[PDB]
Ligand binder design. Structure first.
Ligand code: PLP
Ligand code: PLP
Ligand code: NVU
Ligand code: NVU
Ligand code: CL
Ligand code: CL
Ligand code: CL
Ligand code: CL
Lengths: 356, 361
């Protein structure tokens, strides 16, 4: 049985921290945090407590065998000072799938959300309201076994911390495309937001920077499929081989993290009904022929941190490939950003937004 | 610039745990002290041996969000002469440093860590058991500890070592063979991945699969890879097959280090011993489920086993591939090679035979 928002225990801080004045993504934390413990007696009571360190047994399964998963989502403060979470239900859904994959304890998704709402409420004033700013919400679930056996955890901790953030802005990025690097494999766990999928990318992101690129384009398979950009899903807006203009993104076949922003761009594009929206594999072969025949209009990544990130260059086989994204407006990118902004900041009412 | 064992600070415990009287359960009982070394912008702090205690981590610790974590596992053995010795610890130190570099964690001096570890075991020497088939399991860990959510090279890290007295990994010991679930739906690692490093991230995803092995009546997972169902590893152990190969030659084969195999210290040791004996062909080559099925059908398999620090040499008697229960005749064949490896390792490990492989504490 899940923990209950009704059972929440609140402990306000004695010394509130001084709010910020140029925020650096994920370094500034708010006064409070959520924490819920799990053990053989099930879930304890959730609590909002002052932001404080974790105390873990040195054998903690979180640190030895990566019994760890996370989420990332944003709360936005509208003009009316009202704070809203964007599509949080989908993050709860994904978090639970991640939990099950790692044999971590199940929880009630609406209970956790209410606990998160309550936490954001307590820290409302940390939510910035300046243009392009938001509150980043980082839920985490970790195993906490005090023994070295690789086994289903009998102890777990669920916590949530909050960071006020600005951008991460609408400047295009260059990508290193090198098939030697493989982010995920069919039958793997690339489709879950597990900490173990990110650690190994640090070295690869460094190679990208040495080779004068800003992000990694993760290729998969012998046909060099374009899967993801850094921690973002990848979209290509082009006139396809059959002469039809379309928005394509790779399908959810196991090596793709099902992004919330990704699904939202699909939803928006489908709703407008102005061009084909498809989920289909994208190979470098197709991209090169499309670039050579001038069929490519825009390439970009989607994710919570950047929202929509234009791509202007891919360094593939030591040879730079120009992506004409910015030369094409980037119309679709700008259209996506505008509607998302209007929705997120409450300019248009929308079922996608959850009020705090 | 590494930490130095010369700078070790020792803080003895004021609350020593009662030692075990009852069977040792692997990795559940810990000794009185731990090694702890912190790294940051100033480089490595001073190493310390300190009472066994909890870690204090920032809630944004990159160790918990992006799996900036690696570990090791090695054993100290107490011989008849009551001398405690580590088995080939240099290789573990080598492997740990490789893991660290893969995760952009701070480099250290392998010989300095080894000395610090020696010093720590010396402090808890009375925790080292000496009954037959017992040892002290040593667990070094290195973790990133950046207090920020950026996926980046950490500027803070924590190196620690804890110790566990142990008996056998499986109840019964490496006498009783194990059954394996071999289903291609599960992949432990992939070429271009990080399965060849001892990174926490490789183990988390196996828990669910090990549950499925149990559900289907097996004890461990036989990890298969590729279109041709290559046998890669057994649980957290390397896999060995002793058979008469298709070309009629008696051989010991284990999968090659092509990226999906963790290079086990015991594995290397078994290759080394078997190569030294010069009595049969010893090779590193892929092994497919097709080749095994046929070899078993033609009665060419002698022994199949796992190797690794926790189990040492673990015999296999059954493999459930899809719905076909394959009997593996390891036990009906002695298991002569398994027994020979186990006897030789014991002689070396318990100092019955002085050896360049043992490192005295
Ligand atoms: C988090 C993440 C995304 C984007 O997901 P959103 O829910 O849109 O923020 C894409 N790819 C990977 C690999 C990720 O970890
Ligand atoms: C640790 C480990 C082994 C065996 O390594 P040893 O150094 O022999 O203990 C084998 N396979 C995997 C996957 C491992 O993690
Ligand atoms: O692109 C994203 O927003 C998803 C994401 N996945 O992992 C992250 C780590 C830090 C910041 C952001 C992320
Ligand atoms: O000793 C081994 O077999 C390797 C191993 N790798 O991970 C482990 C966890 C617990 C116990 C043992 C291990
Ligand atoms: Cl929704
Ligand atoms: Cl999926
Ligand atoms: Cl050696
Ligand atoms: Cl290797």
């Amino acid at each position: 049985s899940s923990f209950k928002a009704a059972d929440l225990q609140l402990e306000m801080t004695q010394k509130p921290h001084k709010k910020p004045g140029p925020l650096v993504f994920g370094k500034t934390f708010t006064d409070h945090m959520l924490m819920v413990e799990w053990n053989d007696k099930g879930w304890g009571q959730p609590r909002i407590q002052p932001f404080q360190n974790l105390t873990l047994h040195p054998a903690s399964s979180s640190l030895h065998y990566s019994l760890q998963l996370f989420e990332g989502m944003k709360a936005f403060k509208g003009k009316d000072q009202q704070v809203r979470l964007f599509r949080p239900w989908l993050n709860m859904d994904r978090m639970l799938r991640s939990a099950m994959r790692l044999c971590l304890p199940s929880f009630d998704k609406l209970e956790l959300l209410e606990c998160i709402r309550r936490l954001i409420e307590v820290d409302k004033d940390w939510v910035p309201d300046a243009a392009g700013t938001s509150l980043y919400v980082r839920p985490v679930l970790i195993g906490n076994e005090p023994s070295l056996g690789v086994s289903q955890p009998t102890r777990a901790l669920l916590f949530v911390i909050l960071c006020p953030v600005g951008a991460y802005s609408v400047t295009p990025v260059s990508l290193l495309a090198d098939p030697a690097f493989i982010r995920a494999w069919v039958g793997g766990v690339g489709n879950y937001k597990l900490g173990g999928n990110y650690g190994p990318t640090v070295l690869v992101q460094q190679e990208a920077l040495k080779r004068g690129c800003e992000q990694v384009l993760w290729l998969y398979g012998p046909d060099h499929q374009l899967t993801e950009v850094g921690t973002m899903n990848i979209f290509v807006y082009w006139t396809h081989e059959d002469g039809v203009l379309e928005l394509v993104t790779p399908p959810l076949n196991g090596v793709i993290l099902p992004g919330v922003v990704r699904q939202s761009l699909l939803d928006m594009a489908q709703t407008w009904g102005e061009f084909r929206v498809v989920e289909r594999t994208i190979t470098m072969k197709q991209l090169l022929r499309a670039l050579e025949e001038g069929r490519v209009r825009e390439v970009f990544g989607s994710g919570t941190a950047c929202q929509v990130c234009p791509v202007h260059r891919i360094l593939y086989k030591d040879r730079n490939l120009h992506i004409p994204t910015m030369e094409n407006g980037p119309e679709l990118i700008l259209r996506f950003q505008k509607e998302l902004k209007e929705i997120q900041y409450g300019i248009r009412a929308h079922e996608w937004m959850f009020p705090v």
